[PDB]
Amino acid sequence: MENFQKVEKIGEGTYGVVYKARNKLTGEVVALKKIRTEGVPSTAIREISLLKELNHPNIVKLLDVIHTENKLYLVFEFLHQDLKKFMDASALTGIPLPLIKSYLFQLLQGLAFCHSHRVLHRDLKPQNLLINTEGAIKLADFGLARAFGVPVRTYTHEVVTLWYRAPEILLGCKYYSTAVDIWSLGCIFAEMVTRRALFPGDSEIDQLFRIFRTLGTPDEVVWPGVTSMPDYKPSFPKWARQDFSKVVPPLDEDGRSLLSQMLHYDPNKRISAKAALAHPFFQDVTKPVPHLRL
Ligand SMILES: NC(=O)c1cc([N+](=O)[O-])ccc1NCc1cnccn1
């Protein structure tokens, strides 16, 4: 607002416009998000305010929540680049495996923390993962979807991606669990490895069928209860599961094994962030410094 001098528009998120701004008094540089209408659910403000206590090194810190004139501003710690941008910039040679592994490991520590505190992200995607020059990666917008809701776009005609959405969400399950975040992270993990989105659906049904075409159409054997879900249709085509080795080549067996557990259809069989941290894939994990051009 007036306490903050806008440095520039960082973009227009799935909620509202985001600016890079400097606190005229503290000199701190932050990310200011103008939340989209006419009242601001008091329930929403309490939820959001709880998130200010959710502090972890791999979680973008929510510094302040400012409610004024039906407008809600969220002040976040600022990071210079997101993983989507970094992946595009690394498309020619790919992100080195030690760095992919470091990033996956840090993201899982972040999820483990939020999940132990009963906070869900629900909308993880590369653009929501921020990185810095120190080799750190952080989860942005944790808990906002719950304090608010699931968008059809953003706030003003903007196609929200479904590429990282768990199948239980696509099948209409009303109660999501921490498992939805593990699914999204597995999709991101695969994308870092192959340099191409795993399931780039362009509609809810195309998203679902792209998943089915790769992991096989789910049935009662692999996913007890699936045929009774809200949007499940007996008319869904029946595709056979594809060999995992064809999915994320040339990822090694440790990596393929972890990814397979992160992409289990049954949310109850899907690996937790905590258990994933103990997976043999992280046996030689390290913290490399990325080459970022800011
Ligand atoms: N907290 C942030 O720093 C940040 C916030 C949003 N957002 O709320 O939509 C988007 C990108 C961000 N950083 C990455 C970034 C910042 N400036 C230029 C390029 N990338």
- HSE toward the beta carbon, residue 23, CA cutoff 13 A: 13
Q: What is the resolution of this structure in A?
A: 1.9
- Rg for the chain (alpha carbons), in Å? 19
CATH number belonging to domain 81-291? 1.10.510.10
Strands 71-77 and 4-12: unpaired
DSSP 73-100: EEEEE--SEEHHHHHHHTTTT---HHHH
Are 282 and 102 contacting, i.e. CB atoms less than 8 angstroms apart? Answer: no
CA of 11 to the centre of ligand 1 (A): 8
Distance CA 89, CA 94 (A): 9
Distance CA 255, CA 209 (A): 24
Distance CA 265, CA 166 (A): 8
DSSP assignment, residue 231?
T
CA of 157 to the centre of ligand 1 (A): 20
β-sheet with 17-23: strand ranges across: 4-12, 17-23, 29-35, 71-77, 62-68
Q: CB count, 10 Å around CB of 22? A: 17
Annotation says 88 is catalytic: no
Distance CA 197, CA 139 (A): 19
Are 10 and 81 contacting, i.e. CB atoms less than 8 angstroms apart? Answer: no
Distance CA 139, CA 55 (A): 11
Distance CA 65, CA 67 (A): 7
3-state secondary structure of 53: coil
Give the residue whose CA is nearest to atom 19 of ligand 1: 81
Are 164 and 125 contacting, i.e. CB atoms less than 8 angstroms apart? Answer: yes
HEC readout, 109-123:
HHHHHHHHCCCCCCC
Distance CA 280, CA 272 (A): 15
CATH number belonging to domain 1-80? 3.30.200.20
Domain residue extents for the chain? 1-80, 81-291
Method: X-ray
Question: Could you tell me which of 87, 60, 96 has the C-alpha nearest to residue 75?
Answer: 60
Are 14 and 160 contacting, i.e. CB atoms less than 8 angstroms apart? Answer: yes
Nearest atom in ligand 1 to 141's CA: 8
Residues comprising the binding site for ATP? 10-18, 33, 77-79, 82, 125-128, 141
Are 181 and 58 contacting, i.e. CB atoms less than 8 angstroms apart? Answer: no
Exposure string (b/e) for 40-59, b if CB count within 10 Å is 16 or more?
Answer: beeebeebbeebeeeebebb
Query: Which residues does ligand 1 sit against, CB inside 6 Å?
Result: 10-11, 13, 18, 20, 31, 33, 60, 76, 78-82, 130, 140
